Design a protein around this ligand. Structure first.
Ligand code: FES
Ligand code: FES
Ligand code: FES
Ligand code: FES
Ligand code: FES
Ligand code: FES
Ligand SMILES: [Fe+2]
Ligand SMILES: [Fe+2]
Ligand SMILES: [Fe+2]
Lengths: 388, 104, 388, 388, 103, 106
């Protein structure tokens, strides 16, 4: 009910996905790095359209909805944490506990009947690999692994990265990321030349439809995703032609990368190896609201000891972060933005003219529609509405 | 433990009767058909008096925001209400209705 | 007419008030001070969504709608007052009399059949206590006293004030002003400390609900309002506690002020005494459009002669204005702005969770709903519609 | 359907016109001057709500819709013309021929079944008198002469001009231009004084309605328009009066100009002679979107050779452009903008109170409603829709 | 004082006839069923001719903006019309329609 | 081969669709409308969808991807967003056996 019913009736193959303009509820989402949230210093953020507050108390993170139950103001306008375990609204002093959101006191009226009877929404928060994950859902959360790509949580896998807000719906980011033929926009990337990478312009598909991908729905951890196998039978394009004349060539570098690409619910891509044969890239496209998303980038590299783990960081800052995460992925950013207009009115979901390599995207759309854990709605944002 | 409310005949089916208590919060008595029920009078979503609301079957609708509760179970029936209403035991003894004046 | 019918259906206790997003028609409203408009110098303003023009001719004020009858342009784009008693539209020269709005001439066609056959909307304007009031309504206006708080018009009451545009719907301003527990936001006020005022953090209600307020359904002049009596049997709260420990304290000043607080239609608050034992504050929250209002503040002090009023004016400019009107009330301004989001989609009127002191607000909502003289609609702004 | 059906039902005399908020499809429209588009330099523009790309190849102009068939991005975000006769989308390399829009190649997949089976929308482009005209329509275009005022295409008529984007719907511009009484806004024009022009303040109409204009639908080239004949039986107003007293006079210059004023579909005005007895002014109000238009101004003056053309050019840049096109018409620009609010909600089309000289505008509204070649709809912009 | 307009049979039911008056504003004569009424012809909201409008029962709808008036009372029946129409009593005698010279 | 053997006419129920895969060529879709048979390319001209996985309504097939549609007899578009006609292949029944042409109609 986020999109015109007429359009949903048309996209019979993935209507839930097209309706999920605000993202999927009941999944874990990374929103910041552990280093960005300090003890006793609450931070604000918007996730799936909801304003939230995250605080660190005795080293542990807590998440409360940033909206007072009384008159609906954001507590963050003027933060008043009067005791270690609570936060007091600046307006009429309704006070809530960070651990369970219970309204435990009201300074403007200590005798109010509301005390102890109301509860502000709280969301589970977990830190892993130096990343802050919030379970934007209801009830006890599933393990974080269900919503992370394979190997992200490996013991020796050292994770580093960056995050920023991008102006496009999260779905446009996901599809661009899993798009087999979009590598064409990266043909002039510095990382390509500078890191001597082998990078074609596209692929001439081979085999049947089913062979183009590997849909994963038998993962013991509960993971649900899709693998892009266009390269298994497809002939990579290194000489692009027009009228039979070669007008462009791919990158004939020596380093073999990105032979393993997969997208996983709620919306995280895994590219392996990348940006180097001994590394991996994991990136999330987190829904902030219908028009924006967090582009949460991470690069992983196994490290067995405190050293090298340090050399990795040094190289991350010196090469990987500026040359790959930025130098390479920056083109993905404006590419996402370029699709905004066509899909803004939801009509792009009907008028798009797909071609062979989009089989991977269609597979993702179907997987997401069938295995998402809930459709976030504006009602979830303002307050659920119902008549039993 | 019981409070003298009124004669069962003083209430037509589908009506609500507020029961004010000395030094205590008010209660609401509902007559659904030929049976009586009671809960706190104050809506759990705010400060509204449910006795000034509308009774439809066994569901009372709050006059403030349209939230609702089942008068038998005290469980929320319509948004924005989410906190169960306190229900009080009712007893009809010899024509007149009585309320436990004590949370069930 | 201005809100989703499903929402109005839910708020049975005050549907008209919730619907009155643009304000109440057929009431007097202050919009500027007398000294802000000089002879023959037309001034523009927007009230209840309507663009208006006010001019002073031979000392008297006149108000015409700032929209030519012909092609709907604002006359004020290029003012042309070619004769003392008229204004000529800059486009095709349709000319109107300030006195009755009659189309008395058309320079581009002196033989037009429209001449003397059309009338531009006019609104009554009255000056009192140095304030300019406009009756944004139809037909003969009621006495100005009906729409003003008691004593504002007293012969000896010397009125001085300030006015500005605030970005919030007028109702949020009204409710914040009459909110008994909102004083918590003023706990760190410089005025309170410097003027040694007694100011609790809030009140623990005493007595019954009916005793919390006093509704005035009629006066010798027909005014409609509500008095906040939470302090009659309520216990002032000077110590703020959380989990039983003291985390805050109210102001233990000696000066007892604000023992008399009342809100009146169309939306004007009276606080007496304030900000000093010998003064009173009267403030209006005038609807400009759905998202903004004029915060028209005035401080009154009885003065018997020119000596007292001269001294008062000096005290006002050097102390009361900067310390009270600005220093104290500035916190009210951002408090109002903080409630905008929750009520912007009109859902806050359903999802708000009220507590005891809100009995005052509820009383106002009901009083306003039962006695307002009309609901301003977008149709009033563009032109009333009706199809036989 | 671009307007609320209730409103369209009310304006029975010209509903199609009121519905044409985006302009009329299937007409030629000037969008720039030939000197503004150079060989191999693609230029972007929006016409009738559609984003277009124009390019010059071997001297000839070609027009392609600036929206890739694949994922709906604008090709112009990053232009890639790899061969003289084609353009390659920067995203997945779908390549189209400028000549017919046929998808002739796809660099990311040379085996794609889409190759040669899809075609991007193209529109006829024609250069005449140094002006670039685009036929925003379907099928074989009609002769350009049909959509141009008489004499614009005369062999010796030398055309010079200026173009800019104005913030108002195209119809407000058309009506202001053909509005007989709007000349009142030009009473203080520097051009009038500095060129000794005779310019009344308005006109007192004479004769019956039919005589106020001349509806042209008998032109052999098929052009459809209306001539303003208010001055044939009307009395020019040179003494403007209020209450019978003269407050303003018109201009008593010696030069006789503006003897013939005519408006033509799709929306081009011809004023003759102007701004001098031996010149003519032809101006278009081209729909860009519902809120803006190109104000395409041109001045024509018969020239028999290169020597006269150069002389005229010099007088144009030094006098006519700054004094007439800018100095005189600049008042028309803000006049158009002043009507935006009244008509923005489409209600002005119902609430406007017209007077006698508006007979000219009504005639135009009726002609446009009856002879336009199609109503541009948002569906034309996003993609025509239809269910079996 | 009265003006002889036409024969009752000159007008079919539900039609309108414009009556020009030299040196004066035109009038509109409406035939509603077998009854006749008259008002000023010019819509009070603009320059439209009501005789070029649509008659629905005893309500004339202006062709320009959909405003309307009750031809019997001359009072506005639909927005944007707000100024009442001038009404002229009409009488039919011996199959002849006469319209008063004044309102 | 000129005529490709598809199946027994009786093996198809009225209102059903059957996909015909071909070596070295794009798949075809055979439709049974009443007692008659028609055939077109299987791939929707608007994308990469398989029309045989769509919904047949009379002589109009609806694509499962975006709701576009085609008339199976003429191959002409019946519903947006489809705009490119489908290639149609003649179908004949010999000895109760359905045969579809290897080359589309001109
Ligand atoms: S809005 Fe937070 S305590 Fe009132
Ligand atoms: S106070 Fe009862 S629904 Fe809100
Ligand atoms: S818009 Fe004012 S006179 Fe024409
Ligand atoms: S969006 Fe243009 S080739 Fe894909
Ligand atoms: S001119 Fe008759 S309704 Fe406007
Ligand atoms: S792929 Fe068939 S309608 Fe789009
Ligand atoms: Fe990319
Ligand atoms: Fe305040
Ligand atoms: Fe002009």
């Amino acid at each position: 009910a986020n999109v015109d019913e007429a359009i949903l009736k048309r996209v019979k193959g993935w209507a839930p996905y097209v309706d999920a303009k605000l993202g999927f509820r009941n999944h874990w989402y990374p929103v910041m790095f552990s280093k960005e949230i300090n003890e006793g210093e609450p931070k604000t953020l918007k996730l799936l359209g909801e304003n939230l507050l995250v605080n660190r108390i005795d080293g542990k993170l807590y998440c409360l909805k940033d909206r007072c139950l009384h008159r609906g103001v954001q507590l963050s306008v003027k933060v008043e944490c009067k005791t270690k375990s609570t936060i007091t609204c600046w307006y009429h002093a309704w006070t809530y506990r960070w651990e369970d959101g219970v309204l435990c006191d009201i300074l403007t009226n200590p005798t109010s009947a509301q005390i102890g009877r109301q509860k502000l929404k709280t969301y589970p928060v977990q830190e892993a690999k130096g990343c802050v994950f919030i379970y934007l859902g209801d009830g006890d959360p599933p393990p974080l692994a269900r919503d992370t790509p394979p190997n992200f949580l490996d013991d020796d896998m050292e994770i580093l990265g960056k995050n920023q807000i991008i102006k496009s719906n999260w779905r446009l980011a996901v599809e661009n990321g899993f798009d087999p033929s979009h590598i064409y926009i990266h043909k002039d990337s510095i990382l390509v030349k500078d890191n001597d990478l082998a990078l074609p312009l596209g692929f001439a598909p081979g085999g049947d439809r089913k062979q183009q991908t590997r849909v994963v729905d038998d993962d013991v951890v509960g993971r649900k995703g899709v693998y892009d196998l266009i390269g298994e039978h497809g002939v990579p394009v290194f000489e692009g032609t027009i009228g039979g004349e070669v007008v462009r060539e791919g990158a004939y570098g020596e380093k073999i990368v990105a032979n393993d690409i997969s997208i996983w619910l709620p919306g995280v891509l895994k590219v392996n190896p990348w940006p180097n044969p001994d590394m991996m890239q994991f990136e999330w496209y987190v829904p902030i609201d219908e028009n924006t998303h967090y582009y949460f980038q991470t690069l992983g590299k196994p490290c067995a000891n405190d050293e090298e783990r340090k050399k990795y960081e040094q190289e991350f800052e010196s090469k990987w972060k500026p040359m790959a995460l930025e130098g390479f992925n920056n083109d993905d950013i404006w590419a996402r933005e370029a699709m905004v207009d066509f899909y803004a009115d939801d009509k792009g979901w009907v008028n798009e003219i797909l071609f062979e390599s989009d089989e991977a995207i269609v597979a993702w759309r179907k997987l997401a529609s069938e295995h998402n854990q809930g459709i976030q709605t504006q009602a979830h944002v303002s307050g659920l509405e119902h008549h039993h | 433990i019981w409070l003298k409310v009124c004669a069962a005949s003083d209430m037509q089916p589908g009506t609500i009767r507020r029961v004010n208590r000395v030094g205590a919060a008010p209660l609401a008595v509902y007559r659904v058909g030929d049976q009586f029920y009671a809960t706190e009078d104050t809506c759990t979503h705010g400060i509204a008096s449910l006795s000034e609301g509308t009774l439809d079957g066994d569901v009372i609708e709050c006059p403030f925001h349209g939230g609702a509760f089942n008068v038998c179970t005290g469980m929320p029936a319509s948004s924005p209400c989410t906190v169960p209403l306190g229900v009080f035991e009712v007893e009809v003894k010899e024509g007149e209705v009585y309320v436990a004046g004590e949370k069930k």
